[model samples]
Target chain A: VLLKNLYLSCDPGFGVGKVVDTGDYVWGLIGEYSLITKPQGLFKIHHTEIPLSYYTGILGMVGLTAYVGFYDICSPKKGERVFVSAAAGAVGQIVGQFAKQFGCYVVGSAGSDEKVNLLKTKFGFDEAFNYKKEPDLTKALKRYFPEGIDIYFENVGGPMLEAVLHNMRIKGRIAACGMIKPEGVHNLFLIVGKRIRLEGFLVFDHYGSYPEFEEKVVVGKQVVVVSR
Target chain B: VVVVNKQVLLKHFIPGAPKETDMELVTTGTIRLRVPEGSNAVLLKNLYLSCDPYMRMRMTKYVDDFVPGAPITGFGVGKVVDSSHPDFKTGDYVWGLIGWEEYSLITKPQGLFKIHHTEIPLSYYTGILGMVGLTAYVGFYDICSPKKGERVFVSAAAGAVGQIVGQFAKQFGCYVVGSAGSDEKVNLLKTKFGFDEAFNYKKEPDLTKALKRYFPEGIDIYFENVGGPMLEAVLHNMRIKGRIAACGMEGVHNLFLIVGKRIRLEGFLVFDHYGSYPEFEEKVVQLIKEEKIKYLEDIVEGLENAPAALIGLFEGRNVGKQVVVVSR
Candidate 1:
């Protein structure tokens, strides 16, 4: 039977999303569509009004990164200072709200003031600023955090990351979500004096625990729907 | 004029951090102020004399500048009371050599340079063209490696060295800013030397915040005339890989506190870098000729006031370089 494709999810950050000529799934996702036909154990057919493409994102590794990076890798304490970049978009918005739920002090930056205002008033961020308005970014950081930042949820990279490095407290931790810039590692010396942690994970590796994960998020009404 | 008398000798060099009581002003019989004929010796009546921070280093019991009781000597402008040296004669107006006391007999005159430009006030030799002047010049230009249009932050910017350092930086087309103790000194930095900005550090409570607010791009070179908390705050606001040429920390508060800012902090003695003196003299004389630079002296009337003048530099009582007049 053909499953309904109700909602399709697309993330521009996912593996460049380019189709190359190396193999069947050389560059982007390919084999997964056919692999489901010859399932070994859990062979029961499932039906939903949502489209099968939703499986690539909501049930995909991007969702797992949003979960694990916030909960497991970063045990964010109450009253901890947090900065989220691209904060009006998908994974970042969810992570920022999750931090707020844990009683954290959250500040986010976006490309425009409109999105920045949304992050504050709509998403309940403690503060938000349009990063473009800041010419000298280090000075901007002083305005955002006078006491020095405790935790940085870094979703952007390059110069922004370098400025954040200067503003960190002596032992503050950083969760490097992604290096949005092309050339990211030129100046790593800024990291030498800071205490930062980074980790990456894939949800496909834990396919066996899929049923329990879906039930928990849907029942709690806590996972705010941001991405497909 | 070659009358002979006994002279006071060091009672056996005093040790570390000597107080004023360590020095006694008693008359020992003196030797003639005039050197014997045919000797290459020059006798000078110590006139306007400089009381510098280095003198304290010499007073230490075991280490530094002059040996205890060996007639503490430094830069001075004096009159040649009597002389046999070919370069100098009796009644010549020279400004080099001599002890801290009224009369000195010099056997050699190599470190001495002749004072030909006596047309300028002779007292200026004790400061502007003297050791203090060269020190400020070398530290600001050579060590700090200043660039045109760069922002320079000079601490104690109204002191002898600080005042000259700021003026030299401004002359090099730099955006010079200085921190001083009082409104009057800050005004001097702005009005007299053409510092782009001059601030009273005492009025600024949170120095680091004040730094960021004023210097949005941060400081490029810091002429460290003052240390302690000012240095600490300046460090926090320093741009990556900035340069600092430290002269002295004579007035650093909380003496035992450990304060350093992980930047290149270099110290220098003006005498060690003597290779640059002729060049320094040329540039300084030119600056003086153009009327672009001004040197200030906090002058005391008598040799008896040397102790007060020295202590005043440390206590921030003197506005500029301190000088004492013994005999002229």
Candidate 2:
């Protein structure tokens, strides 16, 4: 079917297009006035009367990333220690807030003090750090998580990852999606000693949770309620 | 208290690389060649000694009872000369943890394993028929939990249990590659132990690159012996939900690999596994008689060389299972 696009979202690899043949709004697009020979990925628009631009972000893939990684992978418990690397990024910021809502102690690591401020002051993270300023990432993590991190939302890899392995508590969970790429980390022996569960995940594998996520996570009652 | 006992004593708690002076060999200790009654005690003449990596854990004190003045205790084969319990008498051969001395009084005779079939060498009890064999069995079959046709990578492949684990992986129908520090051990792994591929890790500067090249499809099970850079490298190359039997790290930085791959890395102590010994020993002995397993031992003569043999383990000096021939 042909498509006359109403609004093309500025997301990394996502778009919302209209079927010119049927004029039905469906998502999973990446271009304006583009042809989709097969629209398997496209999901028809069934929304809650929010801003259509919300589909590009919070109401769409980006929001789902934070939820799946935190709830499904991390298995976060209330009052548990949670640390988010790259906490000021698109996925990190939401995970940090979601952690706060879950009644967990939230610490976020960002590239700058400004972003760190955003995590704590704006995102309501319990603690935030400018990782660039910290020479020893492991020491920095130890300072924040004195009891050791129970769940780590890993976005940035490299030394920061090595640092988290050191501070991760016994049977800790790491939901890894390394956006910043790779670095050589040497201290892996701690994984066995700590009985850590480090799992790398792809957001595409989580598209199945979109309906369940929208209902429970975003649309349940209040967006920022810390009841549980 | 007639005969003087020669003993090896730790001088102090080692903080760095081990040295010969850290332990002092002395003939000053003397013990009566008799077992005290009213206890399950046995006086044994210690024979062969097994040197293992776990001994390194005591150097910096993993136990609150770590004493510098005391003699280093380890697994060994012994001939029971005197006993208080009904289970043993004079001239009975046994294998278990005993003092690193010429003569030892095993206060807990229950802990000592009685050597059943002496058809094979008594020294084999220190390794293949003892805790070392059990260590490989538990780590490979129980911990790593590999199925047929799974790919396995064994680190420190020529080490005591590492060498045995390589053969276990082969017999279990797995594509196995192993790493050794020396070229001779690399040859030893491929030829005698029969690994799918074996390499000298010291020559491979970029370990992650080297690992990916061998395990192009990615590794499913890793018998992790050596830690640090190799551990980091293996994590990078591990398949999804891979299992790591940490039968032993530098700080593994690429643990993000674990997150994405969902790897399960577990550690176990052979000390916790005495319960499995009867079952394992019975089975391992069967394998030994059938010749399904080949055993190797790096023998050093006398208690005086025990420190060097133990130290050689860390330095990749020993080619196989490092054992000290005490009185034999």
Candidate 3:
């Protein structure tokens, strides 16, 4: 039987597999041919109303990441100010929406004006900025967050981080979700002075909370679920 | 009646690395020993003044800058010769924010902590029993919260807080490795401090490789005292769900690596951990008495040498806790 090959998303994380032979000991639902492989770890399409590919993005790892990072790591309270770096991307877009829904004044930064516009209008961010166009990242952040950032969902870490560190309010939380290089930061000293907690997480660790995450994302989010 | 008080006055606000000339040893204008009535003040005879890296921030305009030509203030052990405060009494030993002088009239003794146990060397209050001890305790046990058999790494491991943190991690039943500036300190870390592995960071060309060799399983807790490149290397080798207790000024330049590694980088002040002081003192004092902990002090005699001692700290001249004895 020639069936569609379902592969794991992303390059660095979990790998791809296909079903060739049947199973006895374990449930071989989505797979190729591995003896030790089990059925429980596999994903099958449950919601026919939405597209199957939506499982890879919103209903999958990316969804769980945004959910855990924003709710668990950020722990955003209502009326608190939030700033998300790389705000137009897969993860950033969801975080911005969550913050806005939670009654936070959400601000986001993207690399292009097009993405910046998408953040503001589509993602419902209170304000959005093109980090590339802005000459000074610190000043850009200050312009957006006049009261100072309470939660910084950090995706890009470098010059933007130095600026964000200088602008973080008292007892701010920095949920570091991504980075480019391992350069030393200039404003880590402010972490102590301002009592900022910078925490990181792997999306794999958050899979246990996927059910709760799925239920939360399904409502209000205008996600396009395309079928093959 | 006016009394002569020798003081170490700040010559000016410093920009970069402070110089010995930036501080002046001058006779300050004097005051009566008795606290003025209708005011709660504690008049202290300054004993042992602490020379710490955080004081560098105070010299500059960054944090609480020292006023030009004013007597520099720091954590010091002193004798309460005169007191109108309800908590303090005459001849009681105290330690807190006192001036770098022979005598100081403390108007607001709010920050000052009374030295209860004098059986241990009174100077211990300046390092192990005072702010530095509390800093290590809070950073290691409270922040990092290491589990038994876990790998722990410490940068600036021979310094005031690093030494204590390494030992605390060891006592917690974790495998501890430390990086210091010199071979002498490396030896002290391994021999005296009971570190599993110790290396001279200055001698090592590749810090990341060094960490890899030391922590093949990956580091669980990183007690950060020296920031900059060292921090970058530690971040690279950190295990999943690692904890970085940043006590020093310099930190991860490439903060992005922390995301992939799933690290928790938290910074804290020692003063915030003051609530655990009573418990910390009880444990540390017992450790010292029972020979479970070792404390080394690099004390410079006289307030005249206070400037040199403090400058020496930035230069890495002292082997251990740098203290300036004004009138001990």
TM-score of each: 0.54, 0.78, 0.90
Q: Write the per-residue lDDT of candidate 2 for residues B77-117, one digit (tens) a residue.
A: 99988898889999999998888899999888888888988
lDDT of 2 by residue, A28-88 (tens): 7545366778877777667636545556566667778888989988988999999998788
Could you give candidate 2's fraction of true interface contacts? 0.47
Tell me the tens digit of each residue's lDDT in model 3 across A17-95.
3334521111112323344344456543445465444555666667768889999999889999999988888888989
> What does candidate 3's lDDT look like per residue over B87-199, in tens digits?
89998999998898888888898778889898888989999999999999989988887899999998889899999998988888999999888898999999899999999
- iRMSD for each candidate structure, in the order shown: 18.9, 3.9, 2.5
lDDT of 2 at B122: 91
How does model 3 score by TM-score?
Answer: 0.90
Off by over 4 Å in 3: A1-36, A43-53, A181-184, A217-228, B250-254
Best by TM-score: 3
Model 3 DockQ reads 0.56
- Give the TM-score ranking, best first: 3, 2, 1
RMSD of each: 18.9, 5.6, 3.9
User: What is the fraction of true interface contacts found in candidate 3?
Assistant: 0.82
